[PDB]
Amino acid sequence: KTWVRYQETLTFENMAGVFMLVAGGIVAGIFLIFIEIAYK
Amino acid sequence: NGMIGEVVYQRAVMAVGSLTINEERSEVVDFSVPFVETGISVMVSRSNPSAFLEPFSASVWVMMFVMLLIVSAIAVFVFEYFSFTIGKAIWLLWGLVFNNSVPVQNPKGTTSKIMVSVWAFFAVIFLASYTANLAAFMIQEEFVDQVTGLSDKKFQRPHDYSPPFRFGTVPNGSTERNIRNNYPYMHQYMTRFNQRGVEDALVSLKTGKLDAFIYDAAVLNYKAGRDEGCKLVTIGSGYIFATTGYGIALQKGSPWKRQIDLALLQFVGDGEM
Amino acid sequence: SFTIGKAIWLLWGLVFNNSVPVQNPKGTTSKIMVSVWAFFAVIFLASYTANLAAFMIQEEFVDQVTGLSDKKFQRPHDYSPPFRFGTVPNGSTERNIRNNYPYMHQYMTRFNQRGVEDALVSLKTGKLDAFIYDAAVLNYKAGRDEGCKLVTIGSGYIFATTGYGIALQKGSPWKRQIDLALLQFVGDGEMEELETLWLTGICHNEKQLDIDNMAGVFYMLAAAMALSLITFIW
Amino acid sequence: TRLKIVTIHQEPFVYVKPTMSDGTCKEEFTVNGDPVKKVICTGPNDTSPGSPRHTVPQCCYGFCIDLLIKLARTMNFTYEVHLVADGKFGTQERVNNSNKKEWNGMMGELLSGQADMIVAPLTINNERAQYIEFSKPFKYQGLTILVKKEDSFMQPFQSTLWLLVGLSVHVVAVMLYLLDRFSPLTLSSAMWFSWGVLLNSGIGEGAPRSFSARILGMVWAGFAMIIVASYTANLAAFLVLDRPEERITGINDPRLRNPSDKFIYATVKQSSVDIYFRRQVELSTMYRHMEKHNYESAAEAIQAVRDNKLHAFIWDSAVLEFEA
Amino acid sequence: SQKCDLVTTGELFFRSGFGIGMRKDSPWKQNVSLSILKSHENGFMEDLD
Ligand SMILES: *[C@@H]1O[C@H](CO)[C@@H](O[C@@H]2O[C@H](CO)[C@@H](O)[C@H](O)[C@H]2NC(C)=O)[C@H](O)[C@H]1NC(C)=O
Ligand SMILES: *[C@@H]1O[C@H](CO)[C@@H](O[C@@H]2O[C@H](CO)[C@@H](O)[C@H](O)[C@H]2NC(C)=O)[C@H](O)[C@H]1NC(C)=O
Ligand SMILES: *[C@@H]1O[C@H](CO)[C@@H](O[C@@H]2O[C@H](CO)[C@@H](O)[C@H](O)[C@H]2NC(C)=O)[C@H](O)[C@H]1NC(C)=O
Ligand SMILES: *[C@@H]1O[C@H](CO)[C@@H](O[C@@H]2O[C@H](CO)[C@@H](O)[C@H](O)[C@H]2NC(C)=O)[C@H](O)[C@H]1NC(C)=O
Ligand SMILES: *[C@@H]1O[C@H](CO)[C@@H](O[C@@H]2O[C@H](CO)[C@@H](O)[C@H](O)[C@H]2NC(C)=O)[C@H](O)[C@H]1NC(C)=O
Ligand SMILES: *[C@@H]1O[C@H](CO)[C@@H](O)[C@H](O)[C@H]1NC(C)=O
Numbered sequence: 001k002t003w004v005r006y007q008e009t010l011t012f013e014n015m016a017g018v019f020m021l022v023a024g025g026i027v028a029g030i031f032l033i034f035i036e037i038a039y040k
Numbered sequence: 041n042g043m044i045g046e047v048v049y050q051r052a053v054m055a056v057g058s059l060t061i062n063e064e065r066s067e068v069v070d071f072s073v074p075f076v077e078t079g080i081s082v083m084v085s086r087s088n089p090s091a092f093l094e095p096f097s098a099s100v101w102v103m104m105f106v107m108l109l110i111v112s113a114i115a116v117f118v119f120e121y122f123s124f125t126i127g128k129a130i131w132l133l134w135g136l137v138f139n140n141s142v143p144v145q146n147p148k149g150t151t152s153k154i155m156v157s158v159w160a161f162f163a164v165i166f167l168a169s170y171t172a173n174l175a176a177f178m179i180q181e182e183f184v185d186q187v188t189g190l191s192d193k194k195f196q197r198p199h200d201y202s203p204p205f206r207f208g209t210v211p212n213g214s215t216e217r218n219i220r221n222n223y224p225y226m227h228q229y230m231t232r233f234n235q236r237g238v239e240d241a242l243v244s245l246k247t248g249k250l251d252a253f254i255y256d257a258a259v260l261n262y263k264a265g266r267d268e269g270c271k272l273v274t275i276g277s278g279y280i281f282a283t284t285g286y287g288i289a290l291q292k293g294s295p296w297k298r299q300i301d302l303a304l305l306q307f308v309g310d311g312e313m
Numbered sequence: 314s315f316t317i318g319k320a321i322w323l324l325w326g327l328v329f330n331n332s333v334p335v336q337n338p339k340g341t342t343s344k345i346m347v348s349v350w351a352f353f354a355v356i357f358l359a360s361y362t363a364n365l366a367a368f369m370i371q372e373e374f375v376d377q378v379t380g381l382s383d384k385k386f387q388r389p390h391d392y393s394p395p396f397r398f399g400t401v402p403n404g405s406t407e408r409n410i411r412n413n414y415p416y417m418h419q420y421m422t423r424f425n426q427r428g429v430e431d432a433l434v435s436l437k438t439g440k441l442d443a444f445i446y447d448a449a450v451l452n453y454k455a456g457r458d459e460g461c462k463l464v465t466i467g468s469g470y471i472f473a474t475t476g477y478g479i480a481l482q483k484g485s486p487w488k489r490q491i492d493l494a495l496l497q498f499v500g501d502g503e504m505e506e507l508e509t510l511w512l513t514g515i516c517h518n519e520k521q522l523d524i525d526n527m528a529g530v531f532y533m534l535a536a537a538m539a540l541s542l543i544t545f546i547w
Numbered sequence: 548t549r550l551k552i553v554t555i556h557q558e559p560f561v562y563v564k565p566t567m568s569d570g571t572c573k574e575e576f577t578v579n580g581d582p583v584k585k586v587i588c589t590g591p592n593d594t595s596p597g598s599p600r601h602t603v604p605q606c607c608y609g610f611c612i613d614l615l616i617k618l619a620r621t622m623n624f625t626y627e628v629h630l631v632a633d634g635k636f637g638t639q640e641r642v643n644n645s646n647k648k649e650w651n652g653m654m655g656e657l658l659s660g661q662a663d664m665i666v667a668p669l670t671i672n673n674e675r676a677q678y679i680e681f682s683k684p685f686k687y688q689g690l691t692i693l694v695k696k697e698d699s700f701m702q703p704f705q706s707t708l709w710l711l712v713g714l715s716v717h718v719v720a721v722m723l724y725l726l727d728r729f730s731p732l733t734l735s736s737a738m739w740f741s742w743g744v745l746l747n748s749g750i751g752e753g754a755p756r757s758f759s760a761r762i763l764g765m766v767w768a769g770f771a772m773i774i775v776a777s778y779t780a781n782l783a784a785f786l787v788l789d790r791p792e793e794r795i796t797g798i799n800d801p802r803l804r805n806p807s808d809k810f811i812y813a814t815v816k817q818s819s820v821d822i823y824f825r826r827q828v829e830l831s832t833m834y835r836h837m838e839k840h841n842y843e844s845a846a847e848a849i850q851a852v853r854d855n856k857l858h859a860f861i862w863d864s865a866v867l868e869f870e871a
Numbered sequence: 872s873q874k875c876d877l878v879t880t881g882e883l884f885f886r887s888g889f890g891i892g893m894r895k896d897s898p899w900k901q902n903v904s905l906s907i908l909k910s911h912e913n914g915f916m917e918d919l920d
Contacts (some may be wrong), residue, residue, distance in 0.1 A: 002577070003559060003610060004865060007083060009169045011100055014228075014698050021702060026107070029158060033114065033151055037121060040149075073500060074748040074829075079799075134751045139704035143334065148732070153739055153750060157685035160748035162773060166702060172698070175366070179787060191796055220688075298493070305496055322761045331768040332749050362780050369784035382881035413884065502828055509825075509838075511640075517839050519808035521699060521785045523777075526707075528772065537766040545731065545759045 047291060054290045054297075060214040061145060061284060070292050074285030075304050075313065076188060079278035080215075081188060081257035085245050087271060095166075108133055118151050125152075137163045141170025168229065187252065204236065207252035208235035213253060218282060237292070244263065257281065316343075316403040328354050339547060351383060376466050377444070386417065399426035406445065409473070448472065449512075456513035468518060550626040552661035554611060556590075556634060558845055562609040563590055563630070570631055579651070583608055584616060590630035594843065611666050614685075625822040626665075631656060634844050635817040636667075639674055652817075668863075670819035672826075690820065692795050692812075693852060693860040693867050698786055712774065716741060719767055726760045744768050747775070795859045798833075805837055810861050812859035815848065816841035820861060838859070 009015065043059060046052035047070045052070055061071050065286040097105075098230040101196040102283035119125070125144065126134050136156060146152040180191050186196060211234060235241045235250065242263075244250035277295040288304075290297040307313050314336060316323060326333035327350060338344050378385055389395050400406050400421055409417050426432050426441070433454075435441035448469035455463055477497070481488050498504050554561050557659050564585075567573055572585035572621065589608035593597040607628055620627060637652035649655070654675070656662045668686055669675070670850070701709060720741040724734055743750040744767060757764055795803065795812070803810055813823050814837045821837065842848045851857045890907075893900065910916075 002581070002613075003869060007097060009094055009555070009698070011095055011097075014168070015700075018165075018700055026110075026156065029155060030110075030114070033154070033216045034830060037118075037794070133814050139330065139332065139748045141749050143749065150735055150739075156748075157742050157746045158751060160746045161749055164779075168779040168782060169698070171362075171779060172786055175719075175783045175787050189796065191794065204672065278799055279794040279801075281799060298497075301496065302492065302498075319761070322757075322765055326768060327767050329768055329772045331744055331747050331772055333744065333750075333764075333768060334751075334753060354621065358776070365780035366784045369781055369788065376711065379616050382883075384881065413886075500828060502826060504829060505825070505828060505834075512911055514839065521778075522705065522708075523781070527774070530770070534766065534770060538597065539760070541759070541763050542768075544762060545726070 043289075047289060049125060050291070053294075054287060054288060058286050059289055061219070061287060062214070066287065068292075069289045070294075070297070071287035071289050072288050072303055073298060073304050075307065076284075077285050079257040079283040080281045081260055081274045081276060081278070082189075083245060083253050083255060083260050083272060083274065085188065085248060086185070086273065087277075089177065092173075095170065104134075111159075114151065114155070118147055118149055122147055122149065136160065161222060185275045187275060189276055191280050195229075205259060206233040207254065208233050208241065208250065209254045211236065211239065226307040234301070257283075307310065315508055327351065330354065378466060380471060386420075396442040397424050398445065399424050399431065399432060399441060400445045402426075446473075455518050458516055461516040464516070501531070548625065550663040551627040552615065552626050552664055552666055553631055553656055554666045555630065555631055555636070555653055556844070557611070557668065560610040560611065561607055563588070564606045564608075565603075566605055570604050572608075584613070585614055586616075586628050588628040588630060592630060594634065615666055626663075629662075634825060635800070636670070636815075636819050638817045638822060640787070672819065672823065674820075688866075689864045690861060690863040691867060692797065693862055693870075694793060694795065694858065695792060695852060695855060699782065707805055716745060719763070722765065723755075726763075727756065729754060741762075741767075745771050747772065750789050752855050762824075793858070803836075804832060806832075809858065811840070812861070813837045813840035813842060813848075813856050813857070814861045815845060816843055824861075 011019070043055040043057070044065065047055060059065070059071075065071070077204055097313070108130045111133050112125075114125070115129045123145070132141075132144055133156075136159070149154070150188045194201055194205065196244065207231060209219065216230075219230065235244065235253070238253075239256065241253045245253055257274060257276075260272070260274050264270070264274065288297070288300060289299075316336075321354065323335045326335065329348060330351065331455070354522060384391050384454065385396065398421065400410065402425070407418060407421075410421070426435070426444075429446070430439055432444050436444060447467075451463075451465050452468070458464075481491070556563055563860075564573075570587060572587060573583075574585075575583040577583065584607040585608040587604050589602060589604050590607070592603070607630075612628070615626065630652050632650055637650050639648045639653040640651055641647070642649050650658065651666060653662070655860045657665050657679075668688075669681075671681060671684065683825045713843035720738055724737045724740065726739060727733060729807070739750075739752060744764065745753050758825055795810075802810070806812075812833070814824075824837070825834050842851070845862070848857070848860055848862075852860055875901070893903075
């Protein structure tokens with residue numbers, strides 16, 4: 001109980017990092033689009 | 041019981057017939073050199089590109105529609121800041137995927153062309169993954185087996201999967217001791233699923249009264265070479281199995297046995313075996 | 314309407330179809346030729362991707378000689394460097410060659426050598442290319458080789474794979490007891506202990522991105538910059 | 548009266564930690580309300596090539612230390628835990644003089660009188676049972692093989708050619724804009740053309756003034772398409788030639804009878820499991836492969852198998868369950 | 872020389888003797904051997920090749 005019992009192209013796991021990086025790029029691109037519209 | 045009760049209790053001399061080797065039989069008697077290399081396997085019934093659900097599986101399709109709605113909202117915002125891309129932005133975003141659409145005049149606000157380039161790079165890497173999946177389709181050519189071996193997740197509990205199964209060995213033999221020297225839980229799931237006769241277990245596998253039977257691999261290959269119907273192809277050849285040999289067991293201290301080993305080492309190096 | 318002298322840019326842009334607009338084709342014959350050229354470009358791109366796939370399916374590295382019946386061993390005129398190989402004289406190796414290929418003995422007769430140490434010095438200094446010898450002794454020499462340089466072709470896979478024995482006279486009564494002693498020495502780990510002790514083990518067995526292809530494309534791109542500079546200065 | 552307890556650094560059993568200030572042990576708390584009752588042990592720092600001489604009092608705790616505390620709770624005695632110099636179990640090693648087979652490590656320190664009791668998961672075999680007496684076997688633990696069951700798009704892929712293509716299209720756009728300056732939203736139109744040639748999917752643009760720049764544009768178009776075609780082709784063919792076949796499944800595999808540089812398997816140097824594998828005469832080739840990569844400690848084996856330097860490792864089962 | 876889909880490999884192993892399978896003791900053990908020996912020295916395999 002002290003040590004032994006005490007534990008701690010599918011596009012779900014392979015492209016999950018693809019999904020996170022593409023989502024971050026989309027958020028950054030939308031932020032740059034709003035900065036470009038608010039500037040000019 | 042049997043030949044071990046005859047040799048250890050000094051009623052017989054040796055066992056020329058087949059006899060497995062484990063720890064306690066290495067303790068009570070002495071085995072010879074392995075004159076044969078055998079293995080075990082599991083015989084099952086194993087009786088006999090349509091549509092792909094690999095890239096999206098009706099879950100990422102919602103995210104495609106969300107990105108279409110976002111690009112349409114940004115196009116409406118640019119048109120408010122500033123030409124049919126108010127409600128028809130779905131056709132303009134998903135129409136530039138397959139690079140033969142009519143070129144629609146983009147606005148001069150440096151907004152549409154950047155996200156079209158980003159979606160085009162996403163389409164290039166998506167076509168790369170699509171051609172990669174179509175090329176990896178060449179790797180498989182037959183359906184995989186139901187039981188890959190002893191390392192299957194079905195042997196934990198068949199309630200985890202949808203079909204339940206069953207498996208048995210010989211009653212009170214060396215196979216049960218080889219199980220209990222490796223897995224007591226396998227003996228626990230096998231005790232309720234016992235059987236009586238090996239040929240009766242084969243008839244039960246044919247008629248569907250048994251799902252799996254553990255036996256020697258080479259003898260099952262010999263029986264599949266003479267099988268009526270030819271619907272038994274043995275899964276593996278000892279990869280996830282015991283794969284032990286057989287020797288000749290004499291009493292501890294027999295002087296003939298060494299000389300017998302000579303005959304064994306005469307029977308191998310001449311093609312006689 | 315600029316397809317008089319500027320047809321090279323239009324045609325080699327329609328080779329790749331990288332979304333390069335040129336003009337609005339009103340002639341039917343021009344659109345038919347562009348459609349046939351686009352179909353040819355699609356099947357050429359398919360053949361190019363199939364060529365790259367077939368090149369990647371080919372393995373990383375192969376040996377220089379991958380067989381006893383190699384075309385190098387028949388005649389070294391097949392390849393541009395004339396190689397060389399020698400065996401040990403006054404032994405059973407040359408007889409086993411002559412029991413299989415006396416022509417190999419004929420090619421070896423012009424490529425003779427003196428001794429094993431002399432052939433070793435010839436392999437170190439570069440006076441010998443290949444040397445036919447036993448399997449495990451060359452493995453012992455490779456395990457003590459400083460730098461893991463001299464490595465055999467594999468580990469003796471496509472060879473005869475013979476064994477060693479103890480020769481006695483025909484009719485020796487001690488032969489059965491010697492066979493008893495040897496088969497006792499094998500089946501107890503004693504021979505395994507001697508093969509662990511008296512064999513060295515320093516040199517072991519067999520100790521998306523590319524480098525040279527886009528470098529050559531960079532050389533052709535530097536030539537393209539040179540051609541663009543020539544067309545820019547005139 | 549004074550028992551010199553010797554042990555080996557086992558990772559789930561003997562946790563060794565340096566002291567806080569001077570010879571003290573931090574009374575840490577577990578999740579079940581049990582305070583960590585450490586003992587002040589005396590241990591070395593590294594191996595003989597590692598450290599010349601560095602032996603300090605540190606804190607030992609864990610499984611076997613609590614077992615020794617339970618033994619001292621049952622039977623009344625005094626003890627002091629000291630560590631072994633090396634990190635090996637002990638083999639029947641041939642010494643030079645007089646051709647004698649000797650034992651080292653914990654057995655070499657116990658039989659020489661330097662120790663009083665070995666506290667370790669001792670493997671019971673023929674050689675060690677005929678010399679000293681044993682106790683009741685408390686642990687029943689089998690062997691298993693630790694393996695690595697594990698699409699290089701941008702982030703798992705190395706960062707050379709991405710920044711190279713970015714700087715390349717930057718330099719191409721700058722020199723096309725400079726040629727648009729020196730003709731034989733202009734910059735925004737040049738960026739639109741440069742990112743539309745690379746777009747490769749369709750855009751509603753035109754054709755800039757390229758009387759001496761159409762060659763650079765067509766070569767850049769063919770250059771971008773041949774880069775993305777080679778990248779798509781070798782990623783696809785790489786993940787095709789990526790073999791899912793990785794499992795070994797025990798001692799029985801005909802592929803390991805003739806191994807290669809891919810099927811990597813080894814064990815801990817001078818371990819009793821290696822002695823048991825050397826004892827069986829049908830395990831000659833696998834022993835010759837495991838002796839190629841003999842590892843000193845288990846942490847080096849964990850670091851090698853985590854960094855994809857290994858493919859298979861022979862180790863006890865419950866310790867690897869704890870590591871899982 | 873008949874078709875164009877055949878490659879003969881360089882493996883020339885077990886260079887045996889293709890001759891005539893003969894009987895037991897017989898007076899045609901020597902005279903047939905002398906006729907074959909006369910066939911060796913002249914162009915008898917060469918013209919048949
Ligand atoms: C399992 O072992 C037991 C012995 O421990 C065997 O049980 C015997 O089975 C026969 C069947 O006719 C009975 O007549 C005996 O009375 C049983 N003996 C008992 C009660 O111990 C059994 O045969 C073994 N399994 C096998 C070999 O099939
Ligand atoms: C290999 O054995 C042969 C004899 O079968 C040796 O060849 C000759 O041996 C005689 C007597 O020693 C010498 O006088 C000749 O000069 C030798 N001729 C040559 C050049 O071979 C030969 O010396 C032996 N040594 C080798 C090369 O292994
Ligand atoms: C703890 O130590 C004490 C001695 O201080 C032990 O008490 C004596 O043990 C001896 C052992 O032979 C007995 O003969 C005596 O009967 C004990 N003392 C008396 C006078 O009763 C005690 O046994 C030890 N406890 C343990 C668990 O070993
Ligand atoms: C044991 O003794 C030998 C000398 O008998 C020491 O030296 C080694 O000797 C062998 C040949 O018998 C050489 O192959 C080694 O290269 C020698 N070792 C050296 C100097 O690197 C050997 O060092 C001694 N080993 C022990 C355990 O002390
Ligand atoms: C077969 O070989 C033998 C030995 O060379 C020869 O036999 C001669 O045969 C003729 C037949 O008339 C006899 O007259 C001679 O006397 C034989 N001579 C000898 C040497 O024995 C001859 O070459 C062949 N003929 C046969 C069939 O005997
Ligand atoms: C010794 O141990 C300390 C930690 O207590 C460590 O920082 C150091 O690198 C080790 N080496 C030596 C001999 O100083």
